[PDB]
Amino acid sequence: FVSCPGAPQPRYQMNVANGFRVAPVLGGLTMPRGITLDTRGNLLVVERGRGLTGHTLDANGCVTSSKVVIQDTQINHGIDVHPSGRRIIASSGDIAWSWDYDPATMTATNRRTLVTGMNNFYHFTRTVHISRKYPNLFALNVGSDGNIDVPTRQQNSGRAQIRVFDYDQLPQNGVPFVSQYGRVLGYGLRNDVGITEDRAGNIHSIENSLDNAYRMVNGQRRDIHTNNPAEKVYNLGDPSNPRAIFGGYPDCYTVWEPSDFTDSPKQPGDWFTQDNSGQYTDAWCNANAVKPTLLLPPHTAPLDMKFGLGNDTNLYVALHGSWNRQPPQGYKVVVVPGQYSASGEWSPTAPLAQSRTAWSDLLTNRNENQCSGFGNANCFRPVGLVWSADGQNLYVSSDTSGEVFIIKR
Ligand SMILES: *[C@@H]1O[C@H](CO)[C@@H](O)[C@H](O)[C@H]1NC(C)=O
Ligand SMILES: [Ca+2]
């Protein structure tokens, strides 16, 4: 394999790990965000500002036709297909809806309002993940309204958190996100756009963390934002038994670079607070917040993640790239090694404190330090991931370049 019929050349140089090939399958798209495959293996793409588009594939995974499945200018990121193949869920910043779906024609009908009231203008994506282990359940993310959204200390804020809803008991008129119907799976999660599940059905989420981090040292604010805090994954466990795991936001953050803490011995993965004073101290965080399972580099902006299939026991993560770092970093897809327990729970191979060097590049730009999150990007910016059912093809969207790629084994 070299390329797909009729497909454009890539907008930017693209490097993929030895053993794989990459090529565009689509270009000229409108802000492609979340992507998935339906039960016929068709590609569905949220083109933010246009709607959900559907694309039939050939034997090589290349596109043979394109249509508009949902004509809607508000759906902005989230998409998932129910395991039955006959229902889809997609969301605006404010509302999650379902549609009846016919994969034979890629046709969505009978829009139904599920969950309401979620809008904010700061973190406005509403990731959807339908549980495969419990197909009546679905999770929705609402990120913080601001860098440091103090009300998110409370679950009932409705932000920086993931709730799980029982579709099969959901009122047909739909319900507010903050309601008894939305069981809090995790809160204190600043912006957890990527959500997936392991073979045991545990929900794993990944986070975009704090901007412009500082640390108070001797009553003076020390800028530590270049290399802190870490981006990070949480294992939120069983969505049929939600218990409101607290991830530490808006007070507690995760160390990436210990050297920045000149008066406090830290290791990667430890908690820190910016002021380390009052109630919400480093020690308070250790007693009251649950640690992540793995780290990724500051500001790299994970937006999706997916486990490998078949023989592959890795985690794959789309890093959209930074804006709040110089030089910039991310703008890639990475691989995190892991393993499954006897009952199917995924964990990383590296200990948390050793995880800074555990991950590897899969798909990269020419030079991440030449990319930018301000002005022209000069780079593709990964958003969404999905594996083909055979585990042989990994699709990757890039919103700002209008592209979807195929990575082929
Ligand atoms: C998975 O199997 C393929 C052959 O089908 C092989 O080439 C590859 O080494 C295997 N990978 C792992 C991680 O065992
Ligand atoms: Ca950030």
Author numbering: 241 to 649
Manuscript excerpt for this entry:
The apo-AA12 domain crystal used for the high-resolution data set diffracted to a 1.5-Å resolution, and the final model was refined to R and Rfree values of 10.7% and 13.4%, respectively. Since molecular replacement using the first diffraction data set was not successful, multiple isomorphous replacement (MIR) was used for the initial phase determination of the apo-AA12 domain crystals soaked in the mother liquor containing Pt, Au, or Hg ions. The asymmetric unit of the apo-AA12 domain crystal contains a single AA12 domain (residues 241 to 649 of the full-length CcPDH) with 1 calcium ion, 1 formate ion, 1 sulfate ion, 2 glycerol molecules, and 778 water molecules. A polyethylene glycol molecule is partially modeled as a triethylene glycol moiety located close to Asp601 in the apo-AA12 domain. The structures of the apo- and holo-AA12 domains are almost identical, with the C-α root mean square deviation (RMSD) being equal to 0.77 Å. In the crystallized apo-AA12 domain, the calcium ion-binding site is completely obscured by adjacent molecules in the crystal symmetry; i.e., Arg606 of the symmetry mate interacts with the sulfate ion, which is a calcium ion ligand, via two hydrogen bonds. This crystal packing arrangement appears to prevent PQQ binding, which explains why soaking PQQ to obtain the crystallized holostructure did not succeed. The soaking method was not successful for obtaining the holo-form structure of the PQQ, most likely due to the way in which the apo-form of the crystal was packed. Therefore, the holo-form of the AA12 domain was prepared in solution and crystallized under different conditions.
The enzyme, pyranose dehydrogenase (PDH), from the filamentous fungus Coprinopsis cinerea (CcPDH) of the Basidiomycete division, is composed of a catalytic PQQ-dependent domain classified as a member of the novel auxiliary activity family 12 (AA12), an AA8 cytochrome b domain, and a family 1 carbohydrate-binding module (CBM1), as defined by the Carbohydrate-Active Enzymes (CAZy) database. In the catalytic cycle of CcPDH, electrons are transferred from the reduced PQQ in the AA12 domain to heme b in the AA8 domain, which acts as a built-in mediator and transfers electrons to a heterogeneous electron acceptor. Therefore, CcPDH is thought to be involved in the extracellular oxidative degradation of the plant cell wall. Here, we present the crystal structures of the AA12 domain in its apo- and holo-forms and the AA8 domain of this enzyme.
